[PDB]
Amino acid sequence: AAKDIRFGEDARTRMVRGVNVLANAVKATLGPKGRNVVLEKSFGAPTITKDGVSVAKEIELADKFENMGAQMVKEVASKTNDNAGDGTTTATVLAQALIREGAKAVAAGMNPMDLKRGIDQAVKAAVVELKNISKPTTDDKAIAQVGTISANSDESIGNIIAEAMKKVGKEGVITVEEGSGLENELDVVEGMQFDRGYLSPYFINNQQSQSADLDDPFILLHDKKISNVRDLLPVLEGVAKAGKPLLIVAEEVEGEALATLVVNTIRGIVKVVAVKAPGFGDRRKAMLEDMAVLTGGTVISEEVGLALEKATIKDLGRAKKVQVSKENTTIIDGAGDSAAIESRVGQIKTQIEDTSSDYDREKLQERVAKLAGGVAVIKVGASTEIEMKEKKARVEDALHATRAAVEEGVVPGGGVALVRALVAVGNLTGANEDQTHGIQIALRAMEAPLREIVANAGEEPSVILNKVKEGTGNYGYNAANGEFGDMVEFGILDPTKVTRSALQNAASIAGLMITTEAMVADAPK
C-alpha cells in the first residue's frame, strides 16, 4: 500500500523526538533514587515500576516515524539484557545523549561519516581504557561477595552462587528452582545447557522468569525442521496418554507446524514448547546425539531411516525437568545411564587424541564438557509462598550479574566506571575538525548515566560530576545516602561486561541514525 517516505533533517528530527520520548520515560527509573512510572493495565489496576526494562516494553508511539526512532534504540538496548543481564536503562540514555548531539551536529552541517568515526574512535579507546581499570572475579571469596550485593546484601544467596560454581566449575551450568520450605538446597545432577530458546513466545507459561517450565517431560530429538502437524500425530496423541508435557527440539519448526502447537498449548489439549537445534551441518548432529545418550532417547532423522510416523513414546528421551528462556534451553537430571554417557565421552575422548585438525578439537573439547557437565540446581527456601516466589526472582538476578562479572570482572557502579574511562582517554583527536567533535560528543555522553542518577536524586549533577573526576581510584557519589567515597566499600559495582556492552551497543545505533538520510513508513490514510 501507499508508503509515506521522508528525507534529511525532516526525517531525523522525527526519529530523535521518538528516542527523546522513550529515553525520558526509562531514564527516570535510573539510580537508587529512581522515580516511579505508572503503566496502564488492560483490565484492573495499573502497574507501578522503577524498572526501565518494564517501561521500555510498554512504549510505542502513535506517530509512525517517531516510533521507528524509539523501536530502533529500544532494540540495541535489549541487546544488553540478552548478552549481559541488565543495563538497558544505561544503553538507552548513553544512546539518547549520543543521538540528540549527533542530531544537532549534522544540522550544523558537519560531516556525519567523520562524526560516526570519532564516536567509534572514542568508544574503542574507552573500552580498552575500561579493561585497564577492570578487576576480575574468579575465586570463591570474590564470587560470594558479588551475589551478596546483586541480591540486596543477603550473604546466604551470595554463598550458594559461589558454592554451586565450585561444584560445576566457574564457567559451568546453574539453574534455580522452587523451594521445599525455608532454607536453600544445592544438588548437582545430570544435565546439559545450550544456546536456543522458545521458537516463539506463547509457549511461555511462567512469566516470573520469562520461560516455559516442564515437569517429568518426554524429549523429542528430530533433524529435518517439521513443517506440518500430520507427522507428529502418533507422538502428540501418544503423549496425551501418559499425560506428560512434550519438548520438541528440531533443526527448526516452520509455520502450520508451529501454528497449532501455540493454539493447542493455551486451549489445554497437550503442553508443548519447541526450540531450535544448536549449531549447523555436522557438529549439530554430533550435538544432537550428544544429548540423545544423556536423555536415554533416540534421534529421529531419516539419515538412518525413521520418520515421526515411526515414533513411539519409547524412542523419546526423558528427564525430571526442562526449562527455556528468551534464548537458553537447559535439560535437568537425564534418564540415560552411567553406562551410555561416560562410554560416549570415552568414545569422544579418544577422537581428541585422534584429531587430524586444531579447530575440530574445539567442538570436541566443549562437547566433552556439555555431556560431562551436570548442573547445580539451587532450590529456594523462604517461608510463606510469596517470599519463595519473590526471593527466587532475586536469586536469578545475582546468578546473572555474578556470572557476567566472572566473564570480564567488576568496575565501580553509579556511572563512575564510565567517567573514569572518559577522563583517562581525554585529549584524543583524529583526521579533522569533524572527527574530534565526534570524540567530544562521545566522551561528553559518557558523563550522562551518572548525570541522570544525581538529578533523579535531585542534587546539581555538574558539581557532583566535576567532583567525581576531581578524585580518582574507586571514589564517587553514592546517591543512595548522598556521601562520596570508594564506591565498592559502599557495595556498589557493575559487571565490566554490562558497562562495555551498553556503550558499544548505544554507539552502534548512535552511528546508524546519524547516517540515516531517509526513512520509508506506511501511509496512515
* Of 32, 96, 78, 153, nearest in space to 413 by CA: 32
| Under rule CB under 8 A, residue 433 binds a second copy | yes
| Under rule CB under 8 A, residue 489 binds a second copy | no
Q: 63 among the known binding-site residues?
A: no
> Of these, 13, 17, 39, 373, which contacts a second copy (CB under 8 A)?
39
Kindly determine how many residues on this chain lie close enough to bind a second copy according to the rule CB under 8 A: 96
Q: For the segment 305-324, give every residue that binds a second copy (CB under 8 A).
A: 307
**228-260 burial string, b = 16+ CB within 10 Å, else e?**
eeebbeebbebbeeeebbbbbbbbbbeeebbeb
Q: How far is the CB of 216 from a second copy (least distance, A)?
A: 9
| Under rule CB under 8 A, residue 204 binds a second copy | no
Residue 321's φ and ψ, nearest 5 degrees, are -155, 155
| Under rule CB under 8 A, residue 168 binds a second copy | no
Distance in angstroms (rounded) separating the CA atoms of residues 478 and 488: 10
Distance in angstroms (rounded) separating the CA atoms of residues 145 and 148: 5
| Under rule CB under 8 A, residue 304 binds a second copy | no
| Under rule CB under 8 A, residue 436 binds a second copy | yes
Q: How far is the CB of 280 from a second copy (least distance, A)?
A: 4
| Under rule CB under 8 A, residue 3 binds a second copy | yes
Q: How far is the CB of 366 from a second copy (least distance, A)?
A: 12
> Of these, 9, 58, 139, 337, which contacts a second copy (CB under 8 A)?
58
Q: For the segment 13-32, give every residue that binds a second copy (CB under 8 A).
A: 15, 21, 24-25, 28
| Under rule CB under 8 A, residue 232 binds a second copy | no
Q: Say if CB 8 and CB 517 are below 8 A apart.
A: yes
* Of 288, 278, 293, nearest in space to 334 by CA: 293
Q: 479 among the known binding-site residues?
A: yes
Distance in angstroms (rounded) separating the CA atoms of residues 77 and 48: 22
| Under rule CB under 8 A, residue 460 binds a second copy | yes
DSSP state of 327: S
Stretches 41-49, 91-99, 290-298, 344-352: which one binds a second copy (CB under 8 A)?
A: 41-49
The residue type found at 416 is V
Give 93-113 as a DSSP string: HHHHHHHHHHHHHHHTT--HH
Task: For residue 451, give every residue at least 6 positions away whose Cβ sits within 8 Å of its Cβ, in sequence order, or none.
Answer: 415, 461, 465
| Identity of the residue, 165 or 250, whose beta carbon is nearer to a second copy in the bound complex | 250
Q: 29 among the known binding-site residues?
A: yes
Stretches 131-139, 158-166, 339-347, 453-461: which one binds a second copy (CB under 8 A)?
A: 453-461
Place of cell 540486596: 152
Q: How far is the CB of 310 from a second copy (least distance, A)?
A: 12
> Of these, 172, 234, 238, 279, which contacts a second copy (CB under 8 A)?
279
* Of 139, 153, 150, nearest in space to 176 by CA: 150
| Under rule CB under 8 A, residue 233 binds a second copy | no
Distance in angstroms (rounded) separating the CA atoms of residues 33 and 477: 12
Question: How many Å is the Cα radius of gyration of the chain?
Answer: 26
- Cα atoms in the 13 Å half-sphere on the side-chain side of 7: 0
* Of 520, 226, 198, 176, nearest in space to 382 by CA: 176
Stretches 236-244, 317-325, 365-373, 487-495: which one binds a second copy (CB under 8 A)?
A: 236-244
Distance in angstroms (rounded) separating the CA atoms of residues 423 and 469: 7
| Under rule CB under 8 A, residue 267 binds a second copy | yes
Stretches 128-136, 280-288, 315-323, 334-342: which one binds a second copy (CB under 8 A)?
A: 280-288
| Under rule CB under 8 A, residue 260 binds a second copy | no
Residues at the binding site for ATP are 29-32, 50, 86-90, 414, 478-480, 494
